[PDB]
């Protein structure tokens, strides 16, 4: 009756806030956004890769198979987090408590259309009255589920997902018992984050190729693990 | 005890085979891979179009909804049914009975990275003995979920939602009582989905785009409204 235990771990889990800090010296301009997107991305890597070291069962995977999760996932969960964030808002994105884009500023940072498709996950999920617990366990859950054609143990991952669909199924009984069908509302967000996160890959691979934004080592190792 | 209706009845409603019928008077080449290809989709979906009306209460919907689920969802459903298709075969696609597609052919049509993409959920699909009940009620599935920017009513489009995600539960629960979460792993499976649908509308476009390759009225109409 007290919630699912892998939802509250999930929970204590989480990550602090990370700020953006946009260089107060620098003019704005897209290339100011951009630079800035990409480094607040390198510094969520970090804390991603940290944060995967708690879902039960991840750390007995390959080092080789944890990378492919982390290669094919990353993108979602850095979108989904920016959801999250965004849930009390109306049209604007909190990219951190010190970055929040509204439309004109997706305009100027020539990501109006990544935005656009973002905040249709949010408005989805408000809909919806998306809880952290939901949150957190859909961050997993997208790590475990993200397709990656390089998986060594096929069943180990396999068995890591339904772990968590069951995390998430036991939770949604519980906490949810309004609606029966939930969890599985729930999952069927994630074509639409799947969806934006190719959206948001491709796009940063197409300003990687511009060669105008700098970029750090860690997402430059992660755009380039392809898609 | 005996099966979900909905689910009975999208299997008698499942449209007759349609064969590719590649021009046997015209020299194999990636354009006639291609226009094959292309015009097959075309025939699919005016079939789909027709389908579409058996699901339960898709025809009560507003004709510019109905159009909007089917301009969101047309390259999924035609993936699936390859899927499908495809399932008793090795490392082949049978996009038609006179039209399956080796690593060759797919070599030789500029494909190879979209067909390894939808060779990837056959062999998902495959690990979990995907049957016809389920194919069908995934398609319905993807055509009710397909996230269109553009929908009038978005309160009724949800409700077909669930309706179509009850019958999924309900035939899981009474057929596959020993996997209580089959269900949710079902719907797991639409991420990729999604995402090699994506991978097929980009690439047709840059054909179309190209101007080699001659497309029907119907298919550009799909591909216009683009994604």
Same mark, same amino acid.
């Given at each position: 009756?007290?919630?699912?235990?892998?939802?509250?771990? !999930?929970?204590?889990? &989480?990550p602090?806030?990370?700020?953006?800090?946009?260089?107060? /010296?620098?003019?704005?301009?897209?290339?100011?956004?951009? /630079?800035?997107?990409?480094?607040?991305?390198?510094? &969520?890597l970090?804390?991603?890769?940290?944060?995967?070291?708690?879902?039960?069962?991840?750390?007995?995977?390959?080092?080789?198979?944890?990378?492919? $999760?982390?290669?094919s996932?990353?993108?979602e969960? $850095?979108i989904?987090?920016?959801?999250?964030?965004? !849930?009390?808002?109306?049209?604007?994105?909190?990219?951190?408590?010190?970055?929040?884009?509204?439309?004109?500023?997706?305009?100027?940072?020539?990501?109006?259309?990544?935005?656009?498709?973002?905040?249709?996950?949010?408005?989805?999920?408000?809909?919806?009255?998306?809880?952290? &617990?939901?949150?957190? /366990?859909?961050?997993?859950?997208?790590?475990?589920?993200?397709?990656?054609?390089?998986?060594?143990?096929?069943?180990?991952?396999?068995?890591?997902?339904?772990?968590?669909?069951?995390?998430?199924?036991?939770?949604?009984?519980?906490?949810?018992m309004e609606?029966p069908?939930?969890?599985?509302?729930?999952?069927? +967000?994630?074509?639409?984050?799947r969806?934006?996160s +190719?959206?948001?890959?491709?796009?940063?691979?197409?300003?990687?190729?511009?060669?105008?934004?700098?970029?750090?080592? !860690?997402?430059?190792?992660?755009l380039?693990?392809?898609?």
């Amino acid at each position: 009756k007290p919630y699912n235990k892998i939802v509250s771990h !999930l929970l204590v889990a &989480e990550p602090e806030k990370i700020y953006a800090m946009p260089d107060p /010296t620098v003019p704005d301009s897209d290339i100011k956004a951009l /630079t800035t997107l990409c480094d607040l991305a390198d510094r &969520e890597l970090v804390v991603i890769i940290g944060w995967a070291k708690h879902i039960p069962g991840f750390s007995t995977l390959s080092l080789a198979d944890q990378m492919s $999760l982390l290669q094919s996932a990353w993108m979602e969960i $850095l979108i989904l987090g920016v959801v999250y964030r965004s !849930l009390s808002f109306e049209d604007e994105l909190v990219y951190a408590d010190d970055y929040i884009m509204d439309e004109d500023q997706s305009k100027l940072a020539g990501l109006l259309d990544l935005n656009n498709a973002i905040l249709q996950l949010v408005k989805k999920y408000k809909s919806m009255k998306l809880e952290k &617990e939901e949150f957190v /366990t859909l961050k997993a859950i997208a790590l475990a589920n993200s397709d990656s054609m390089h998986i060594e143990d096929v069943e180990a991952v396999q068995k890591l997902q339904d772990v968590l669909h069951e995390a998430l199924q036991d939770y949604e009984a519980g906490q949810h018992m309004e609606d029966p069908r939930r969890a599985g509302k729930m999952l069927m +967000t994630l074509p639409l984050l799947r969806q934006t996160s +190719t959206k948001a890959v491709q796009h940063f691979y197409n300003i990687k190729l511009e060669g105008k934004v700098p970029m750090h080592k !860690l997402f430059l190792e992660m755009l380039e693990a392809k898609v």
